[PDB]
Design a protein around this nucleic acid. Sequence first.
RNA 1: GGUGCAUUAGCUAGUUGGUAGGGUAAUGGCCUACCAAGGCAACGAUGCAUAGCCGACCUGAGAGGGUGAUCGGCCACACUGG
RNA 2: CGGUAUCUAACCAGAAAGCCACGGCUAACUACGUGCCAGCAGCCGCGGUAAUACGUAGGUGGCAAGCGUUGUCCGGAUUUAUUGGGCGUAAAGCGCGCGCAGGCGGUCUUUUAAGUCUGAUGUGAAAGCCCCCGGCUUAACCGGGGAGGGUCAUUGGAAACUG
Lengths: 156, 80, 88, 199, 131, 134
Amino acid sequence: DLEERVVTINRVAKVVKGGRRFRFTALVVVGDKNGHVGFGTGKAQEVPDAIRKAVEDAKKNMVFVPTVDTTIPHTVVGHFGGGEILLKPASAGSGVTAGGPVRAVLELAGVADVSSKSLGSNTPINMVRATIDGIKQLKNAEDVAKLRGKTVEELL
Amino acid sequence: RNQRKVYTGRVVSDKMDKTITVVVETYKKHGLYGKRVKYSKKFKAHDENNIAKTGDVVRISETRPLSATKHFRLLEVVEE
Amino acid sequence: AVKIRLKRMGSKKKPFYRIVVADSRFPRDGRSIETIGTYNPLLDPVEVKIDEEATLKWMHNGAKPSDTVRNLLSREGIMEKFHNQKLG
Amino acid sequence: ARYTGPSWKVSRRLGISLSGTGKELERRPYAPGQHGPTQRKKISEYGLQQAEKQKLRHMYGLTERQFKNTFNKAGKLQGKHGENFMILLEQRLDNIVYRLGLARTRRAARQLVNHGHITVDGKRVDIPSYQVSVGQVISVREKSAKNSAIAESLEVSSFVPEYVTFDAETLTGSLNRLPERSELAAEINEAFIVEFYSR
Amino acid sequence: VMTDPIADFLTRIRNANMVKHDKLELPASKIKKEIAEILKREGFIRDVEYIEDDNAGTIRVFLKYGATGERVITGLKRISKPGLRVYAKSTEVPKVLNGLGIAIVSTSQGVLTDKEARAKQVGGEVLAYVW
Amino acid sequence: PTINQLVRKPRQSKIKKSTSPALNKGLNSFKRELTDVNSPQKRGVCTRVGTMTPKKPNSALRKYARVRLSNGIEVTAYIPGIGHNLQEHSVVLIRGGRVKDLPGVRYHIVRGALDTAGVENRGQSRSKYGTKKP
RNA sequence: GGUGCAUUAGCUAGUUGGUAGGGUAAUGGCCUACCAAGGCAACGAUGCAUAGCCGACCUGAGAGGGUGAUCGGCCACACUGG
RNA sequence: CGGUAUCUAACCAGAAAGCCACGGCUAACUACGUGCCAGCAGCCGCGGUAAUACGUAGGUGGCAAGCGUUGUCCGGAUUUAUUGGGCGUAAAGCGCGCGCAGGCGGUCUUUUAAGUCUGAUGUGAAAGCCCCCGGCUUAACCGGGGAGGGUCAUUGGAAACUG
Ligand SMILES: [Mg+2]
Ligand SMILES: [Mg+2]
Ligand SMILES: [Mg+2]
Ligand SMILES: [Mg+2]
Ligand SMILES: [Mg+2]
Ligand SMILES: [Mg+2]
Ligand SMILES: [Mg+2]
Ligand SMILES: [Mg+2]
Ligand SMILES: [Mg+2]
Ligand SMILES: [Mg+2]
Ligand SMILES: [Mg+2]
Ligand SMILES: [Mg+2]
Ligand SMILES: [Mg+2]
Ligand SMILES: [Mg+2]
Ligand SMILES: [Mg+2]
Ligand SMILES: [Mg+2]
Ligand SMILES: [Mg+2]
Ligand SMILES: [Mg+2]
Ligand SMILES: [Mg+2]
Ligand SMILES: [Mg+2]
Ligand SMILES: [Mg+2]
Ligand SMILES: [Mg+2]
Ligand SMILES: [Mg+2]
Ligand SMILES: [Mg+2]
Ligand SMILES: [Mg+2]
Ligand SMILES: [Mg+2]
Ligand SMILES: [Mg+2]
Ligand SMILES: [Mg+2]
Ligand SMILES: [Mg+2]
Ligand SMILES: [Mg+2]
Ligand SMILES: [Mg+2]
Ligand SMILES: [Mg+2]
Ligand SMILES: [Mg+2]
Ligand SMILES: [Mg+2]
Ligand SMILES: [Mg+2]
Ligand SMILES: [Mg+2]
Ligand SMILES: [Mg+2]
């Protein structure tokens, strides 16, 4: 059982001879607070039907976020097109400090204390892409030692 | 005994009597960017017997004002 | 003539004095040479903390306590030492 | 009593039953106003953060400016900022009197402290915002003593928290130790309070 | 012309990582020896060998990848460029990626990593960030 | 640019421009020279009262004034509220604020500060328009 | 060590150094006679415009940006010139 | 100062609540009047006989002895980008060359110690920010101790890197 959060609902149009036909596009972030999160996109003639398509789509982009002490292991920078996101660990109890669409991908992912800053564009779809582009770079300390052949206490 | 300050530079002009002009080259990092830059300001030294010649490398020590502008005296002539 | 004197600081009707060494010419709350101690008059047993070493050093260089200071130093008891080191 | 208005709608608007239960439920549990029964609407991120502030402010019943000041000095300690905020507020003399059972509500407790009816360490104190430490004794100092209002509220006191000690013969209350976050309110999201003040 | 031979060492490793090349070789130098030797100490590179020739010798480095082809080195950066040299005091030595990476510092006691520098209270020139 | 280029000539930032030039200027009658001091309000005597029409697509009739400020600058102000009592040769207080519809109007006349009086029968938002408690 | 303008390129003649003397609490073109022609400047002289300087204050994640009222230190001024 | 601060004795719920917003940004919506008029406005922009945007009511929301507007400064502004931007088509590579000054510079050994790192001494006043205690019934406020703050001066070391 996952949680839903509608980010943006936008009305788009294509021009056809007689006039204009309008459609609704919805962007939805889905995940459980344990560390899994994903996003999707839908399109329909009605707002309720656009969400349902986006929920099913979002269940195909699930990603895992590694966290230590309810905080990301280190500092990463996302990048996707014209949008980029800076994610930074923060002290316990500070809470999430994030912009509009980047809060959803962090509160749903279960991260409790993290600081961020959007250095790029403002488009909601490119902020979600640029954020997940940062979670990919995120590594745990346990796995780093495994690649480097060291042990955890030797690293730190 | 308290000690005055001694510098080291390169002679530039000897067209005046009893004195020489010495340029001292020094480094100083830029305030905001942090890059070392050349900085040269020339002094006046007292040449007691016109020993130093143009282009020499000398050492000069600080003294009481000998004139309107001179307040250094020549000490050594390291190179010619 | 450098002399040691009080310096008024604190709040309205709540004075607190800081024993300082300064010239007579300078303002009451201005330049000073150095600070020796404090003085609280509001405490019913008046409490004072003094260096007992910088005072004796200064009083052999031409420093004179004022009217209130002399009472403080006598009660604390270093003018006796100023007596004894003078003749000895 | 800084806010003298009806203390019944604030529970209905906030949605949490302040002072136990009954203010919100039983009666109309929806928000006050003309458009209470119908016309519901969604809440944005600003609304959710702002609504959390209003619960703490109106639960302990103190003004905005103090709330900001006590928040700032709460975060100067060592530990989690949100948890230290409720611990610091729990220290107030109003709350301790409320916790001991000498008053029924916080408004009653605040007036009781205000009109010099209590004493700490045998000295009269009239500041509601006085921060009680651990080990200090709080009493009544006779005078009012056997007062009908104070004696009536003693009977209707339900239970007493474990971090306060009080016996109803000398009325000598005391704070056993500094309280814990888990045993305070438990219906507030302190993470939203700290996020509200960082925008 | 060639103005920064150390930058070439840093960028040749990066260029070979993208295409998953299993080895590379490049002209040798004394300073490159420690940098290459340091990387072998923390497992960033799988091996290193020296080839002796007329001009300056030659060094080849064997890159390291995890099982199922994950990069071990995910980035290399030059800090103290010839155009703007940087120096760090004893307490100013950084922590690359919150201790999960390393920084190479050319102290007065030799070329050694950031972790070792803070154990001897010495500073120097920060050369590279490897994470 | 390169660090050496950035040292030979450093970075010069842009300069903002004030939108209320007349409010932040003074005058010295002894020297007949404008002095540079900021000020939140200025007073002056109005020389002409009238109306013009706003830009498209608005179509109302906006009531303005033409005031000569105490420092000797001729500006155009705007009277808010329903109905006024301004006439030529009247002393009024102006304060900052630009009206979008009007082309050249850049200031607002405050109501209730001087010869200009408050608005009649104002029940709410009374701090503006200067109407006292009824 | 802390400001704008190159749509402000040359500035200076007791100016630059020397010899003897005068004067001052004290060194010194500080002043005088003689002798020589030097000195500064694209690392910004000169000129125009603006400004008391600092500890500090406001803001800012920080690096920085703006200010220099009150309190403390230094300076200059006392209707305008000598 | 001054019969000032401060105590105890009694009577009174009695003398003590306003300011701004409610289309979005931004927490909070319904009636009536007007009918591109009166008017509103920081931006998008609302008003042309069913206006949650104009005016007034009822209700609500933010603060409270206040609350709003104006003026000035920093932030958001990575919108002068050292930290932290760019120049094919969006603003942005001189039409091209020869070259003084300046900036940068292949590999190794020995030495030096200007740059670089480090220890000691002197100093960077007091007040202010920050940390730890204490007094005013609490706080503001006031004391005691400490910390920080320099391309600073003298002196002793290290030799990898630049010179
Ligand atoms: Mg006494
Ligand atoms: Mg209005
Ligand atoms: Mg200077
Ligand atoms: Mg002479
Ligand atoms: Mg002269
Ligand atoms: Mg000049
Ligand atoms: Mg910033
Ligand atoms: Mg600063
Ligand atoms: Mg004044
Ligand atoms: Mg006069
Ligand atoms: Mg009396
Ligand atoms: Mg009493
Ligand atoms: Mg009564
Ligand atoms: Mg809303
Ligand atoms: Mg209508
Ligand atoms: Mg509105
Ligand atoms: Mg209205
Ligand atoms: Mg109303
Ligand atoms: Mg109200
Ligand atoms: Mg108040
Ligand atoms: Mg105000
Ligand atoms: Mg303003
Ligand atoms: Mg900026
Ligand atoms: Mg750009
Ligand atoms: Mg290019
Ligand atoms: Mg074009
Ligand atoms: Mg173009
Ligand atoms: Mg070309
Ligand atoms: Mg050259
Ligand atoms: Mg070299
Ligand atoms: Mg060179
Ligand atoms: Mg100090
Ligand atoms: Mg205390
Ligand atoms: Mg203090
Ligand atoms: Mg102190
Ligand atoms: Mg060597
Ligand atoms: Mg050596």
